[PDB]
Amino acid sequence: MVPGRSFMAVKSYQAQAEGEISLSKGEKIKVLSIGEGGFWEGQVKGRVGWFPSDCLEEVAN
């Protein structure tokens, strides 16, 4: 439900939809919105949109 802790991307992503955005391995993705399944909205070095959380991972380790 709209998390705060910034998650780090473990892999890059190539936007395919109209509201989808790309990603960058090692880039700190700041989630801003969420939906269902492994998909949610976030921000990456500027690029803010929708994308699969599969390419994202906590920043604990």
Swiss-Prot record:
Signal peptide: none annotated. It is found in: Cytoplasm; Postsynaptic density; Synapse. Changing residue 17 to D: In a colorectal cancer sample; somatic mutation. Residues 2-61 form the SH3 domain. Expressed in brain particularly in the amygdala, hippocampus, substantia nigra and thalamus. Isoform 2 seems to be expressed ubiquitously. Coiled coil: none annotated. Belongs to the SHANK family. Seems to be an adapter protein in the postsynaptic density (PSD) of excitatory synapses that interconnects receptors of the postsynaptic membrane including NMDA-type and metabotropic glutamate receptors via complexes with GKAP/PSD-95 and Homer, respectively, and the actin-based cytoskeleton. Plays a role in the structural and functional organization of the dendritic spine and synaptic junction. May homomultimerize via its SAM domain. Interacts with the C-terminus of SSTR2 via the PDZ domain. Interacts with IGSF9, SHARPIN, SPTAN1, HOMER1 and DLGAP1/GKAP isoforms 1 and 2. Part of a complex with DLG4/PSD-95 and DLGAP1/GKAP. Interacts with BAIAP2. Interacts with HOMER1 and HOMER3. This is SH3 and multiple ankyrin repeat domains protein 1. The lineage of its organism: Eukaryota, Metazoa, Chordata, Craniata, Vertebrata. The chain holds residues 554 to 613 of 2161 of the full protein.
